[PDB]
Design a protein around this ligand. Structure first.
Ligand code: CDL
Ligand code: CDL
Ligand code: CDL
Ligand code: CDL
Ligand code: PC1
Ligand code: PC1
Ligand code: PC1
Ligand code: SF4
Ligand code: F3S
Ligand code: FES
Lengths: 102, 42, 114, 64, 83, 102, 217, 198, 279, 44, 75
């Protein structure tokens, strides 16, 4: 370009140096490392239900052949129990405020 | 030998449908445009 | 359930009923607010005139003739009437029904002695 | 570290105590409220209204 | 769902008796907001006591109407005592 | 926590009775109610001078109270039948239409 | 509901009340039409089946309950004047900003985004970047400001609070002009013998508590 | 009593040795992968103890163990595992530096490519500017020096010439033989130019 | 500095040159037209004063054989010798003369230009490849991609005969028949859209077909390694099964089918690496 | 969806090739987290 | 290719922990317990609310400076 190319180089070098300092400054480097591994664990080892069962059926745990139905039962029971608790709370509130209405 | 392949398919389809339902609001329209072309009661 | 047309008939009619009750409330409150402001202004001007309260900017101070304030007389009479009739007031630990009964008894006594 | 935290907590409690005692002085700088007759027999102090009567001087009649 | 919606619309409506006329209803609303000069000192005690017996608008309205009746009687007596 | 709180607690019987009486009033007291809403629409009548709307409000409330009384024996019988149907409901349109014709 | 535009106020004895009534009746048609459209939308949405309505109602139709509430409140207050806005700056500053963000008073040109993009244009003109990058880095901050400006529904709640406050203020100010004639005689004596700008409603409560604490009783 | 120390030591030794067994496979796979995104096939096909290997290698090189709990064979195996993890860390640093240099060359190539595309109505320049030529010259010099430094490792030298030098060849194909072209590519037109049929 | 002027020039450039989208200078001034019109692309990036310069030649069809290469040679021998073009085999076997023969990437020599004198015929370089000179693109990026696939026989194990031939049989010979006939003319690659957008990370139809030929070679025992090499990033995945790589092959090969089978093997290869590696 | 969307971005847009697959896989993680958060909160 | 839409999960995430299946029962128990705590308080707030108007619910409005809010008729 022109004489401003020196300013361009200075600015880009300053940005590079700041990035380098921030990345591998001991505490920041350690916390970025731990954050990267935590992100890997979260994304790749999420609580799935479908997975490759390479082991023979004589080796697969019964905890794995029934985990789907355990999860479905727990979620459905939680939902129906929440609905029942909402109905019970509604009737309880109505009865209580009818008793205290007088 | 994927376990619960049907469940995985159903879960992915349900997630996609729910996301498209909430992100686009396709099933929850606004009928203010249709209000002028309507006959009122009372 | 009923038809949605009937449900909306009910909706608009209940809106009108609530608005009518709010109209009653607004009229009563407005006329009594006029009366209340007139009474409060008259009380303040009378108190300042008879040298019972000294008003300096924001805070009022007790004067020499403070014992002759109509507000002081009202306070004494309120305390006396509460003592004589509302005996159990400010300490009634009973339930709401018992509180209503006590208030009704006090009202009947005051009506007898009105 | 524990002793430093305890010292900070006690300093905060001292500030709260100063605020409380100044509020109590403001409450007590008022003239005494007389309770004679039925006003004695049915004192206005109750657990529901205690915060509205704390550190207020009363002259109440009754039998110890 | 329309049942729940009309319940929400029902709630703001006060339950006045069937046999009351509109004029009597308006009178009962007048007495609730009735100015007595004695109220300024009785209202403090009334509010302090009723602050714990109020959970429902029905209780609020009944207690405040009773307090206003007491205040009106006290004001009548006071004005008959201090002409 | 977002739905509006209730002011007056209505029992099921009271709510159904108010529903049916409001429907009857809107089919009967429509003119007075419309006049009252006409008075209560302007700034004056709604906020500044509600004193003007006093007579129209009284007329409307008197008409509604007359509806709530339903002194007619046929009206009482049909209303009781509709209330019974509604309480069994914890449909009813034919009963309502039979009642409203009275 | 089909309120005629001409007001019946005197306009020579209650100028404020007449102006308020004129503004209320002038804009009544537009706000009434928008209210009708919103109510029809809500009714038809309630009329839906399962996940199309009557299940997601009114829990998920919260952007039009707010619109209906704002429309009704603004219908009551026909026009908001800048003099009355500044008073609410005592309670909440930037209330004019909230009203602009919610009420289509003017065109909210992205001044901040445009000047930030111009700042990028200055740097892109020093260590020369292509004009494609210049256009992109001009659009980006303007787009950011537009995203952070429009859709702000908390401004709608702030405007609801302001409209409730202004409605109450106008109702009270309307009563002031009606009873100004009646209180003229008492006002002179009250002002001349009580030198205090405190309100009578505020002074009297001081008297009430003063008699409550220190009185011969 | 020393439950915390026991658990820390057993966790560290377990992870370190387990990832020491599955370390040469990961290094070999990273060798197969191109220098552009050497961590690919782990983000896409199989993350076969790659991220776990990096994390626990850094931990092992930056943690300490209590030799009281270890046996003699256990401590020898753990120390060999720690050495393998440190070598993996050095290998990862090497491949990351090579990948970053590859991306430097690819950035030069993409800057050239954006100036020739038909969609580029934004800026059409017949002649490359001075600073891009200087960057090309400097990067080619660095690439030649890198190849010279890998003279003791013929396989690594061949991989670098195949992968990193390919974009140098692409830059060669994108520029006419005019102006300072002979001087800019003077280091390139000695050996690696003939590797790409030039 | 050099930015704003460049932007103004280029925006003014194409807009003022999109109207004149074919320059068409004439070699000479002619009046009577009994001759076919040849719009031959001309560009010599050796002198600063030169731009893509379609030249309209007029010449009798009869005087040269009905081949595009013969027509170009007639143009570049008698009328304008400055024209350049690669050609050696004259039989459609070397692949040197691959050019855009009237909107199609086919070998110039084994090709027939249209006989209608009214409609001009346009000859252009191979297309999405840098232009060294008139109709002479540089296929060096193509050639280099041929080096990556390791196109030589690779044996894991030796044979016990040590004095005889690798047993291949006639049936297994036919597997690589229809794959080895490619002349590396690079006419499918320059007409393959996936190669248009990613000349770097996409090997191309011809190169992937050569890789498939070496993979299905019966003697070759590095099938898995070759699959791994080609089943990396978008080396092969970028192919979109468009089918234009087969429509324009002068030798009648089927690069589309070759790449389809290669992708099928890759898709099986990913699955096979789990089923056949579990212990 | 994300795979082919990224492929479309990479094929046609030259400047999208500046992003190495390390950054793209980071966009993948962020997008998946955002989608999970969106689905969770829309039911709350 | 030209056929990429499948509901089948990607094999990249289909891996499995060495000590059994992916941790789902534990995480679903944690989620259910979190749901009970979360949809146990909004239920408490929803059904135990009443609206009261008393003239005692109102308190003097104040500015950001703390002094009482009084707006003049003519500002
Ligand atoms: C640019 C636009 C990009 C998006 C384009 C598509 C938008 C439309 C939506 C869409 O496609 O969504 C599908 C989208 C991806 O679909 P796709 O790209 O079309 O291809 C899918 C594959 O074919 C098949 O999918 P798959 O089986 O291969 O997917 C594997 C899946 C398997 O994962 C699961 O099954 C997860 C299950 C639990 C989810 C909720 C967890 C809440 C906690 O894992 C993931 O997707 C990633 C891991 C989970 C991420 C969320 C959980 C962690 C959040 C917190 C992280 C914080 C940062 C790290 C730590 C930092 C510390 C400092 O999936 C997700 O967003 C994942 C979450 C799904 C939640 C619902 C699951 C079913 C529920 C049924 C009831
Ligand atoms: C419906 C049809 C079917 C679906 C179509 C889906 C795509 C729709 C269009 C998307 C447009 C946005 C986009 O991603 O554009 C990328 C696309 C970049 O294309 P490219 O792969 O870099 O190749 C174009 C040139 O060869 C090289 O261009 P350059 O060297 O001048 O620099 C390119 C650079 C310059 O940045 C821009 O031009 C900013 C564009 C957004 C404003 O563009 C970017 O870095 C793109 C960043 C986009 C960020 C999100 C906005 O943007 C443009 O082409 C912008 C053209 C208009 C602006 C300049 C006009 C002259 C101003 C004086
Ligand atoms: C058309 C108009 C439309 C308009 C729409 C507008 C809509 C509304 C606005 C929306 C705005 C948000 C959208 C963008 C979100 C970006 C999120 C983000 O930062 O992603 C990280 C992402 C990192 O890149 P990556 O793809 O993860 O590459 C990782 C590869 O392994 C390696 O990749 P590589 O090969 O490229 O390696 C280079 C890489 C390498 O750089 C790094 O690795 C640096 C760290 C980046 C984040 C960690 C990435 C690690 C790998 C992934 C796992 C993450 C796990 C944790 C997730 C949480 O990057 C650099 O070296 C670049 C220079 C970085 C300088 C600053 C670095 C240190 C930051 C401070 C750290 C302090 C210690 C830790 C925290 C301690 C407690 C506070 O991008 C950036 O960092 C670049 C952009 C931001 C640069 C400055 C960062 C400041 C932090 C906030 C930035 C937010 C955006 C700007 C706001 C400005 C406000 C004034
Ligand atoms: C809780 C269950 C933990 C468990 O089973 O760990 C063993 C198990 C190790 O499995 P593996 O097959 O032996 O080794 C492969 C792992 O990738 C190898 O991963 P690793 O062994 O390095 O992971 C050790 C694991 C802790 O594992 C142990 O301490 C193992 C012994 C447990 C007793 O660390 C954590 O769980 C702490 C980080 C959690 C990050 C959550 C971020 C949320 C945003 O850890 C996992 O499967 C990690 C699950 C992470 C779930 C994140 C969900 C986000 C939504
Ligand atoms: C002269 C330049 C014209 C085109 C200017 C750019 C327009 C599109 C900009 C956004 C592109 C977004 C997608 C993208 O990245 O595409 C890039 C791609 C890139 O194509 P490419 O061939 O340059 O690819 C280069 C690839 N490398 C460098 C890696 C080898 O596509 C295009 O650039 C397409 C360009 C043409 C699009 C249509 C332009 C129409 C202009 C008006 C014509 C009017 C007359 C029409 C005919 C009338 C007949 C009577
Ligand atoms: C026909 C009946 C239709 C009812 C529609 C209103 C449902 C209200 C309850 C949901 C709610 O508020 O949840 C609170 C909260 C949050 O509600 P939300 O997130 O759905 O709504 C928005 C809420 N805010 C304002 C916080 C954003 O919890 C849930 O929604 C989680 C599930 C709770 C389930 C409670 C009962 C659901 C009843 C409908 C189930 C499906 C229809 C079938 C019903 C039975 C028919 C016989
Ligand atoms: C706090 C941590 C929370 C972690 C996530 C929750 C626990 C683990 C989990 O569920 O993971 C999600 C896992 C996800 O695993 P996956 O099997 O979907 O994996 C494939 C992933 N995708 C979708 C990307 C392809 O899903 C489940 O466990 C099931 C979710 C609920 C399914 C429906 C339940 C209700 C069924 C109908 C009831 C009808 C009642 C009557 C009307
Ligand atoms: S496959 Fe056919 S068109 Fe393609 S390079 Fe080979 S001979 Fe030419
Ligand atoms: S057009 Fe190219 S994309 Fe595939 S089938 Fe043909 S090789
Ligand atoms: S000259 Fe040999 S292919 Fe044409």
């Amino acid at each position: 370009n022109h004489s401003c190319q020196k300013v361009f180089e200075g600015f880009v070098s300053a940005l590079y140096d700041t990035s380098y300092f921030f990345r591998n400054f001991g505490p920041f480097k350690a916390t970025i490392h731990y954050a990267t591994y935590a992100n890997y664990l979260a994304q790749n080892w999420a609580p799935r239900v479908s997975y490759i069962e390479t082991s023979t059926p004589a080796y697969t745990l019964a905890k794995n052949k029934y985990a789907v139905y355990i999860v479905y039962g727990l979620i459905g029971g939680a939902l129906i129990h929440n609905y029942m608790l909402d109905n019970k709370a509604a009737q309880k509130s109505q009865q209580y405020y009818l008793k205290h209405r007088d | 030998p994927i376990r619960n392949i049907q469940f995985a398919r159903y879960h992915y389809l349900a997630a996609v449908t729910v996301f498209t339902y909430f992100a686009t609001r396709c099933c929850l329209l606004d009928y203010k445009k249709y209000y002028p072309l309507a006959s009122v009661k009372k | 359930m009923f038809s949605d047309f009937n449900m909306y008939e009910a909706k608009v009619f209940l809106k009108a009923v609530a608005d009518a009750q709010n109209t009653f409330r607004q009229t009563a409150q407005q006329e009594n607010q006029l009366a209340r402001y007139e009474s409060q202004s008259q009380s303040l001007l009378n108190g300042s005139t008879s040298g019972a309260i000294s008003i300096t900017g924001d805070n009022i101070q007790q004067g020499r003739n403070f014992k002759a304030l109509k507000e002081v007389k009202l306070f004494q009479y309120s305390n006396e009437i509460f003592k004589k009739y509302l005996a159990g007031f400010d300490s009634f630990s009973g339930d709401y029904t018992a509180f209503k009964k006590f208030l009704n008894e006090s009202v009947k006594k005051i009506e007898q002695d009105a | 570290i524990g002793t430093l935290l305890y010292g900070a907590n006690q300093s905060s409690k001292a500030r709260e105590n100063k605020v409380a005692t100044e509020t109590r002085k403001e409450r007590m700088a008022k003239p005494t409220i007389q309770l004679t007759g039925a006003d004695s027999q049915n004192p206005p102090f109750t657990e529901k209204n205690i915060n509205d009567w704390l550190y207020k001087t009363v002259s109440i009649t009754g039998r110890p | 769902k329309l049942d729940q919606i009309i319940s929400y619309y029902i709630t703001p409506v006060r339950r006045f008796d069937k046999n009351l006329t509109a004029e009597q209803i308006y009178e009962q609303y007048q007495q609730a907001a009735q100015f007595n000069e004695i109220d300024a000192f009785t209202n403090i005690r009334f509010h302090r006591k009723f602050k714990e017996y109020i959970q429902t608008q029905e209780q609020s309205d009944y207690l405040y109407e009773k307090a206003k009746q007491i205040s009106t009687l006290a004001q009548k007596m006071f004005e008959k005592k201090f002409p | 926590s977002i739905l509006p709180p209730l002011q007056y607690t209505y029992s099921n019987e009271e709510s159904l009775e108010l529903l049916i009486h409001s429907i009857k009033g809107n089919k009967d007291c429509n003119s007075e109610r419309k006049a009252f809403n006409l008075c209560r629409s302007t700034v004056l009548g709604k906020h500044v001078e509600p004193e003007k709307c006093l007579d129209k409000a009284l007329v409307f409330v008197n008409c509604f109270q007359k509806v709530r009384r339903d002194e007619s024996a046929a009206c009482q019988s049909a209303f009781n039948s509709t209330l019974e149907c509604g309480k069994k409901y914890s449909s009813c349109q034919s009963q309502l239409d039979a009642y409203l014709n009275c | 509901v089909r309120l005629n535009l001409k007001s019946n106020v005197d306009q020579n004895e209650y100028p404020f009340l007449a102006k308020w009534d004129k503004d209320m009746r002038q804009n009544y048609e537009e706000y009434q039409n928008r209210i009708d459209a919103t109510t029809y939308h809500l009714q038809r949405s309630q009329r839906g089946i399962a996940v199309f309505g009557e299940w997601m109602y009114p829990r998920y139709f919260q952007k039009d309950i707010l619109e209906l509430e704002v429309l009704r409140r603004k219908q009551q207050l026909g026009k908001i004047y800048p003099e009355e806005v500044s008073s609410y700056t005592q309670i909440n500053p930037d209330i004019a900003n909230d009203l602009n963000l919610t009420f289509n008073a003017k065109l909210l040109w992205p001044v901040r985004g445009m000047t930030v993009g111009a700042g990028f244009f200055a740097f892109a003109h020093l260590f020369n970047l292509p004009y494609s990058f210049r256009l992109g880095l001009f659009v980006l901050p303007t787009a950011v400001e537009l995203a952070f400006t429009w859709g702000n529904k908390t401004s709608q709640f702030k405007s609801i609070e302001f409209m409730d406050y202004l409605l109450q203020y106008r109702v009270s100010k309307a009563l002031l002009e009606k009873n100004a004639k009646h209180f003229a005689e008492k006002k002179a004596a009250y002002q001349k013998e009580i030198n205090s700008s405190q309100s009578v409603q505020d002074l009297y409560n001081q008297l009430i508590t003063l008699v409550s604490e220190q009185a011969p009783s | 009593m020393s439950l915390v120390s026991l658990f820390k030591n057993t966790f560290l030794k377990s992870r370190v040795i387990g990832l020491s067994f599955q370390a040469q496979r990961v290094m070999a796979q990273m060798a197969k992968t191109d220098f552009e995104n050497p961590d690919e096939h782990f983000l896409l096909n199989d993350a076969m103890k790659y991220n776990e290997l990096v994390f626990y290698g850094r931990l092992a090189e930056n943690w300490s163990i209590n030799p009281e709990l270890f046996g003699k064979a256990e401590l020898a195996k753990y120390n060999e595992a720690k050495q393998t993890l440190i070598d993996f860390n050095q290998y990862h640093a090497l491949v990351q530096n090579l990948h970053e240099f590859y991306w430097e060359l690819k950035t030069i190539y993409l800057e050239l490519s954006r100036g020739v595309a038909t969609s580029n109505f934004h800026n059409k320049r017949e002649v490359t500017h001075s600073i891009i030529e200087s960057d090309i010259k400097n990067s080619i010099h660095k690439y030649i020096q890198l190849i010279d430094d890998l003279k003791d490792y013929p396989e690594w030298q061949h991989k670098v010439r195949e992968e990193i030098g390919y974009y140098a060849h692409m830059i060669y194909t994108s520029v006419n033989h005019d102006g300072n072209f002979p001087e800019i590519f003077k280091e390139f037109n000695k050996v690696d130019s003939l590797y790409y049929f030039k | 500095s050099i930015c704003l002027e460049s932007i103004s020039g280029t925006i003014k450039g194409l807009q003022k040159a999109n109207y004149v989208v074919e320059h068409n200078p004439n070699l000479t001034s002619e009046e009577k037209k009994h001759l076919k019109q040849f719009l031959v692309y001309r560009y010599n990036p050796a002198d600063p004063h030169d731009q893509p310069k379609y030249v309209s030649y007029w010449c009798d069809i009869k005087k040269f054989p009905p081949m595009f290469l013969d027509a170009i040679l007639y143009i570049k021998n008698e009328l304008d010798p400055t024209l350049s073009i690669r050609r050696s085999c004259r039989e459609g076997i070397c692949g040197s003369c691959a050019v855009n023969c009237d909107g199609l990437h086919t070998l110039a020599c084994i090709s027939g230009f249209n006989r209608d004198l009214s409609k001009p015929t346009i000859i252009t370089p191979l297309g999405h490849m840098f232009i060294l000179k008139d109709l002479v693109v540089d296929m060096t990026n193509f050639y280099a991609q041929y080096k990556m696939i390791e196109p030589y026989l690779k044996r894991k194990t030796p044979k016990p005969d040590a004095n005889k031939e690798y047993p291949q049989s006639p049936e297994q010979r036919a597997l690589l028949d229809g794959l080895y006939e490619c002349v590396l003319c690079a006419a499918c690659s320059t007409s393959c859209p996936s190669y248009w957008w990613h000349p770097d990370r996409y090997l191309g139809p011809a190169i992937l077909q050569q890789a498939y030929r070496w993979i299905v070679d019966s003697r070759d025992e590095y099938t898995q390694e070759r699959i791994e090499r080609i089943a990396e990033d978008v080396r092969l995945d970028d192919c979109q099964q468009i089918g234009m790589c087969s429509f324009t092959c002068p030798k009648g090969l089927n690069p589309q089918l070759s790449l389809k089978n290669l992708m099928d093997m890759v898709k099986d290869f990913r699955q096979k690496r789990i089923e056949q590696e579990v212990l | 969806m994300f795979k082919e969307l990224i492929h479309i971005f990479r094929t046609y847009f030259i400047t999208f090739r500046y992003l190495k697959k390390s950054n793209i896989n980071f966009l993948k993680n962020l997008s998946y987290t955002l989608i999970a958060y969106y689905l969770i909160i829309n039911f709350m | 290719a030209r056929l990429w839409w499948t509901l089948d999960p990607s094999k990249y995430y289909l891996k499995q922990i060495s000590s059994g299946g992916r941790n789902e029962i534990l995480f679903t128990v944690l989620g259910v317990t979190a749901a009970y705590w979360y949809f146990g308080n909004k239920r408490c707030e929803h059904y135990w609310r009443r609206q009261i108007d008393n003239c005692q619910s109102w308190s003097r409005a104040q500015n950001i400076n703390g002094n009482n809010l009084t707006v003049k008729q003519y500002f």
